[PDB]
Design a protein around this ligand. Structure first.
Ligand SMILES: C[N+](C)(C)CCOP(=O)(O)O
Ligand code: MET
Ligand code: NA
Ligand code: NA
Length: 502
């Protein structure tokens, strides 16, 4: 089996996995919609009772399976529990990262295209009216991704966006095709430091933004000022948990696959804790100090929150660059922003394609080159659905990146810490650890976490089940049909692997 060359490289690779578009895009939006500081408490708790324990659990399962030559859940679930249904459940550790990869890499290509155009200096040019400043950039983004005027099921992506998507796929492939230590690690050791530098620079520059309508400091206060009136709102807790899952790459099967390349005897405790901590730092300190403080700086708090609620991409791809355009050297600043976004996205995308690649390599005994090329082919092909079909992206992000990751987290936790046994699991987690997990967490993993997640899933199901059946748009039914197809495909591949074993 292939392994990480150094501990540093491992740390930065896992951190690259975690730290991504979820930090600089999803987080600011989630925190803004949820009332700033009010969102932070549930966010921190969710980080302690969910993110950390699941992170460790996934590192442990990953290394455990990796020792036996298995980097994916279909096999690992079977090692931990002997059943066919364990494999069928394991299929999600493929389906999820694939589905997410499909749209995620596309958004990444967006950030790349914007990076290029902002570098070369082709951007809308604003003239004191907010709408006259934002409109040009809204039109810019819409032209880029081909957004329809009314609500029209069909998207018309510009040739440039398509070509940039191809390029992005090529970059992902060129990194992935060189393997774990040479391709992923070597890139992480660069991209990560570059990312931190750019993020710090942007944070400072933004902090320097002050106008008659507000300041960045106001945004920081808004984000860090506690509000206890929202603690009774379940939605805030649900959003916090979702954000924790997404940002830490939990339930994506990615952490597990990365961990399967850690040597059996190496410590996953301190490495895991370090990766998670790095992610949280990149999220709350960096991600939260850029977009929101700038939006609040120019348009004030109320308007910043309104913009945040307007959409996820509205803040990152429209508002922020429109704000930058009003400052000296704002175009270059925008460029730095989108470049940061790009590296952050790439480091994650490689991570989510790696599970499929690893299933092909381990189970179907394919060479790395072939596995990577086929994974790339599948992702690229399926991506046309997200590119040309309006609302498809949201649907995939929902079923995979939202519900699926939680369901899968609960599933893996239940299999590892219950069926496989709690004591054996604990011993497996602490084994070889440079430091040991606090005893209390044993009771957190076995009782608190699974109960919390189960409750969450119950609420979610209760709310969504009625809504699902009545939905007007055909694009979402097409997307559902297709991703179900992907699930059948993956299940079939698992079947073939199983047969090959015999
Ligand atoms: C999960 N199941 C009970 C339907 C099938 C189990 O089959 P097997 O893994 O015991 O052979
Ligand atoms: C594409 S890997 C899962 C999401 C990633 N952790 C992020 O926040 O961007
Ligand atoms: Na990343
Ligand atoms: Na993250």
């Amino acid at each position: 089996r292939e392994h990480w060359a150094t501990r540093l490289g491992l740390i930065l690779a896992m951190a690259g996995n975690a730290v991504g578009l979820g930090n600089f895009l999803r987080f600011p939006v989630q925190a803004a919609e949820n009332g700033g500081g009010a969102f932070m408490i549930p966010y921190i708790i969710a980080f302690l009772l969910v993110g950390i324990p699941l992170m460790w659990i996934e590192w442990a399962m990953g290394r455990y399976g990796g020792a036996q030559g298995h980097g994916t859940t279909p096999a690992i679930f079977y090692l931990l529990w002997r059943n066919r249904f364990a494999k069928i459940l394991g299929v999600f550790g493929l389906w999820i990262p694939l589905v997410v990869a499909i749209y995620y890499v596309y958004i990444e290509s967006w950030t790349l295209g914007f990076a290029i155009k902002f570098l070369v200096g082709l951007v809308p040019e604003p003239p004191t009216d907010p709408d006259s400043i934002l409109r040009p950039f809204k039109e810019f983004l819409y032209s880029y991704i081909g957004v329809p005027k009314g609500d029209e099921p069909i998207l018309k992506p510009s040739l440039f966006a398509y070509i940039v998507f191809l390029i992005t796929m090529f970059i992902n492939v060129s990194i992935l095709i060189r393997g774990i230590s040479k391709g992923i690690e070597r890139f992480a050791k660069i991209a990560m430091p570059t990312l931190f530098i750019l993020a710090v620079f942007l944070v400072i520059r933004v902090f320097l933004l002050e106008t008659p309508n507000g300041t960045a400091a106001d945004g920081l206060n808004f984000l860090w000022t506690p509000d206890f009136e929202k603690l009774k709102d379940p939605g805030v807790w649900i959003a916090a948990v979702g954000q924790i899952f997404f940002t830490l790459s939990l339930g994506f099967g990615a952490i597990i696959t990365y961990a399967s390349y850690v040597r059996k005897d190496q410590d996953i405790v301190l490495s895991g804790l370090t990766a998670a901590t790095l992610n949280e730092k990149a999220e709350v300190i960096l991600g939260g100090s850029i977009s929101i403080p700038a939006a609040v700086a120019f348009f004030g708090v109320a308007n910043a929150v309104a913009i945040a609620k307007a959409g996820a991409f509205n803040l990152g791809f429209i508002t922020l660059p429109a704000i930058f355009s009003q400052t000296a050297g704002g175009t270059f600043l925008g460029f730095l922003w989108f470049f940061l976004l790009f590296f952050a996205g790439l480091t994650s995308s490689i991570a989510i394609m790696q599970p499929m690649i690893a299933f092909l390599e381990d189970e179907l005994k394919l060479s790395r080159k072939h596995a990577v090329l086929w994974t790339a082919a599948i992702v690229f092909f399926s991506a046309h659905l997200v590119m040309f079909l309006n609302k498809s992206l949201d649907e995939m992000d929902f079923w995979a990146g939202t519900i699926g990751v939680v369901f899968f987290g609960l599933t893996e936790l239940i299999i590892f810490f219950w069926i496989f046994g709690a004591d054996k699991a604990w011993e497996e987690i602490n084994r070889g650890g440079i430091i040991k997990v606090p005893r209390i967490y044993y009771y957190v993993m076995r009782y608190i976490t699974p109960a919390f997640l189960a409750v969450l899933l119950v609420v979610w199901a209760r709310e969504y089940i009625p809504k699902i059946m009545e939905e007007t748009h055909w694009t979402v039914w097409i997307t559902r049909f297709y991703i179900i197809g992907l699930f059948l495909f993956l299940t079939f591949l698992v079947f073939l692997a199983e047969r090959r074993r015999n």
